[PDB]
Design a protein around this nucleic acid. Sequence first.
RNA 1: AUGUAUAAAAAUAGAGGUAGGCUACUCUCCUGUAUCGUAGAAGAUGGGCGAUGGUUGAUGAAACGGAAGUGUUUUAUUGACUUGUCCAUGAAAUUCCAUGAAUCCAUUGCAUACGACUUUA
RNA 2: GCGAAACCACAGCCUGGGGAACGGGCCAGGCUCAUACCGAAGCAGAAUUCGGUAAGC
RNA 3: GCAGAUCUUGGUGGAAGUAGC
RNA 4: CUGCCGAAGUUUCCGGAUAGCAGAAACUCAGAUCAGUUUUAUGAGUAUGUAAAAUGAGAGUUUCUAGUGGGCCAUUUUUGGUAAGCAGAACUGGCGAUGCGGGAUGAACCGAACGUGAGGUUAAGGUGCCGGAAUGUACGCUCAUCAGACGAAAAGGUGUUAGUUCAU
RNA 5: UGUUUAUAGCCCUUGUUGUAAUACGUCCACUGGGGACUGAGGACUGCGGCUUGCCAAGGAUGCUGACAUAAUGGU
Lengths: 125, 186, 168, 183, 106
Amino acid sequence: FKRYVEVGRVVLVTKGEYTGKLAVIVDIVDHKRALIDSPCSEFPRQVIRYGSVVLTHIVMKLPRGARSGIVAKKWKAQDVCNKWASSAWAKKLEAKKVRSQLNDFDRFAVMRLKKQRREQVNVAV
Amino acid sequence: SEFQKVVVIDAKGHLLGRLASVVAKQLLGGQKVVVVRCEELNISGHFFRNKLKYLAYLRAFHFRAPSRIFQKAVRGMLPHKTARGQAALEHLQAVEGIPPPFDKQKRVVVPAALRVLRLKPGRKYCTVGRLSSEVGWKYNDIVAKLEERRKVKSAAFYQAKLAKQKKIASAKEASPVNQKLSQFGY
Amino acid sequence: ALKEYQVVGRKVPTEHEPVPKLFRMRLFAPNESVAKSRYWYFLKMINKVKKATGEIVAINEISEPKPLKAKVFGIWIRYDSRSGTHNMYKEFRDTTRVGAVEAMYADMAARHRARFRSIRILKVVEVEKKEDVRRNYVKQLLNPHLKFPLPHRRTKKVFAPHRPSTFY
Amino acid sequence: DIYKDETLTIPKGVTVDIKARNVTVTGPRGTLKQNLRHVDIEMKKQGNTIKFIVWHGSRKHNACIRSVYSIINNMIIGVTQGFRYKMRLVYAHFPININLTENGTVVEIRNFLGERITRVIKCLPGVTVSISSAVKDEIILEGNSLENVSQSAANIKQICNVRNKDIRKFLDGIYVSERGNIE
Amino acid sequence: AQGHRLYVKAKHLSFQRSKHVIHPGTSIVKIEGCDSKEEAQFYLGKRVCYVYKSSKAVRGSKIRVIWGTIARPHGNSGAVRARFVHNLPAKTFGSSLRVMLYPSNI
RNA sequence: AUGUAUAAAAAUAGAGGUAGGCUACUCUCCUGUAUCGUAGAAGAUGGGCGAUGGUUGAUGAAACGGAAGUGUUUUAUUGACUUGUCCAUGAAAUUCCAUGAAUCCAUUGCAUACGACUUUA
RNA sequence: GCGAAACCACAGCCUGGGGAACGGGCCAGGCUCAUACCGAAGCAGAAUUCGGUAAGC
RNA sequence: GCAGAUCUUGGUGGAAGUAGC
RNA sequence: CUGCCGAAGUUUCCGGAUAGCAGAAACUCAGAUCAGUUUUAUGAGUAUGUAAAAUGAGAGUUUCUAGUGGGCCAUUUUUGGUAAGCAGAACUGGCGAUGCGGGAUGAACCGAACGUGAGGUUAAGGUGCCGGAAUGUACGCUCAUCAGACGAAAAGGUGUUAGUUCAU
RNA sequence: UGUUUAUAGCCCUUGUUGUAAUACGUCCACUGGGGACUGAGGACUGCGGCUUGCCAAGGAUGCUGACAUAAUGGU
């Protein structure tokens, strides 16, 4: 495998009011629940179930049961932010988020933009 | 969500009851549903369990083809005694394998009926076509032979499409317009 | 959702006894109405004190002091069954004492087909020491190498176009 | 148990690949292919150690893991040293004639207690049966698959079975005498 | 090519019924693309129509329309209740519908 | 009808792509909220510039596709369109939603509730 | 060619369940003595017996 | 003031072109 | 034809005379009484009856005048039973005069008792499809090769699941 | 393994900013939208609020159209 439920793994929340946020497992309550934390201020330390999260490939060195302050310092030290963003997963998600906000005028400018890019067809020319 | 005028469903790895229920509900919605690879339908439970279930049914016409087995399950989930359920049945075409008209068409799957997403790991399941092989169906061997023949041709088309796709993909970043206004997420 | 309620009650004063004894109990109930009713059941069940001759003098909900730290809780119950006499001790790992009882009420109903009325929790105590744990699964949960594969989640959006990854 | 893991040491075989739940164990003696996709046991390769781990399994799943490890160990032993089984024929009045065909692939038994019908037994693939000259009426079968050799020996023993006769009185027959590693 | 389609595709499922009693006054309409009751709140009050054709022509047009309006959601799966000027025929179960974007509040 | 638009297989408890010489690589998956397509009196009239390409229609075609191939391409020429970047006019007072064989026949027995049956004719 | 009468609520496939009959209307659906085989038994073999499997007869 | 009374009178059907003569 | 009232289906003596039930009329009253009411307390033996606080409703008559004057089921109580079942009484309501939602269906089961309609919200029961409504969430239990879903039945199980306790 | 903040930290207690925040419960005669179904009555009386008049206050009125010479209906 590539992903295991271990202390220090970075997980992505996919259910509830914290959907789309990033968190790192701090403690293993049980095979169905785990304690997570995030350096972001709006994300508090909480116990979440594995059904509401997906494990990313990023694993970061954390002592068991670290406090939020220590986790935030370790998160900055290990440069987890912009490392997940370097993955194509985050770029796909970020592109989807930016696409959702796009209004009608931006959509119109896109169609003209992708119309110009389409006619290139410089293959075998 | 969004629908299509005609739908081609690949019945490989789909549970019989779960797929039939979704198909029957879609038929009553006016959609036209075509189910291919009906001989790879899976049913939860041991192959001994379904053999006696079918053997009990053998003890009307006892159809042996896997496609007609699936149609029987779909038929029971429709008001076939009325005209509304009669018209729904005529909008369904269950076939074994992938016939040529549906060979070159997109085949969708129903995650609510997929065996992997619905069956506990390690649970014994039986394949409808494999189960029907020892009840009277005698075309399993040839149906597999065409299936591998279709797969080889399908794989060759995919390589041609993939090789062609590499050309536009390479030229996608060649055009500066892509990078110039990629701020829209595109 | 269950809530841990601290209920203190006593009999009304009379000429025979100027001052009555004070009885305090900790019990779990969704609302204070259930906790007061269950508390009166225990005193009658135990001290043989009539509800009509007593009163509830204090009720208080108790919150988990450390809900962000995983703990192991030992729970003793009494079972009313066809035989009508049983007692078992079980251990659960979680962060909230109330969460253990809710999980406790799940397994008795799942296994023994028991009800809320029959179970009368004598005592709930946090088992901090690893050695005191009598359950193998909790002991497995206490090793320094906790890393396991994902349990399957079996997750309208009908008619998916591509086969789902169904993997990590 | 969160995960029960059984660790085994990889032998000197050239290939110990277990990709796609198929163990293509190739060694100096030969290459043996086995299918393990019917067991829900995760196989992990790390250097010369092969670990079979079952996560959140039951007693039957744990039992299958032990059987899988034994099957893998038997396959590794057969691919490295091989399995050799020797059987001695027993006769009382009518001697039994044994003929080998297709390099021992087909074994014909004749004159079994006066029987006029010859019994033909086909050995499993990868197993060669020869008649040892050291011991009279001794047949030695060597192969890389222990299960195939055992199945072939059982079939030979079942073929030479006395019917409608006293076992205590008529002791004539063919049975496996000894079995072990070729090397 | 690309048509106009200033509306949203929808399907006529059934009447507002119990197990054995039907009420043709209210029809259950599935606005495809809407998947929950909260999403259905956008389409409340919009004008829904059933466009069909008859062989006899009136004013040189063979297309007839029954107009309606979406009233309230139905269930947790985004199906809505619609009341039409003429009750929709029972034979139009599974037939398509058009949900306009007017009246608009966006 | 209202885009009547989309062909891998495969595991899922791992697969595919990518690349090296099946052994070692890498990347992606975590669905389609994707991709293709889409601007004009439903899409006008010219001037262009720029592609000098693209979009296709028309026929003349060869190849492929058994299964239920009946459709995929390859085009050859020609016909136009082009909003790719721009301009100049035009489309409205509908001046608030409604939009030649066979049968009978004769023959025929080869047949037998009856025709049928059966050649000949 | 001449020509009735009895009878006539209406009907007309089954399978079940439907408690009172309910089928014709209602509800859910359709339209093992021998022997063959072996196993056990001293069953010396023959002679076979028993045990099941087995509806082929 | 009618739908019934194996109601009364009259007309007329299916059975039936049947049984049959 | 419509509308408004509307039983009883049985005490008691004995085919009956009563009564009860349901109406009509005349009377006197709301500062008067009444209640398938709950209490308080007196006593008497947790209950009991009586007397006097809460709650609700205006109450008490007198006269004569239609119909009923079977039961079924169900609840509880019951005495003996006795292959076991059951039988026997009594206690109490429902249906019998009553449609409606559910219960696959069904007269006794679960809700609910009815003018004609629009809208809303529920009960009982439900939300895979037939079928209106989550292929909802969170835990577990169950593999059957007859589950489950809606008496041979006690138990046995190299049958499990959780396991507990005791031995080492 | 044992070890005690190191070359990671964790737990407990006080202190701690503090009068923290949040969740939950409850309340506002606090407020901003969206949808649907009804419009009974027919001078004035009344109860209120603003400032004679005015008003969302003892029940719908305005502004428009198209079709009417079809739509709406009915059978």
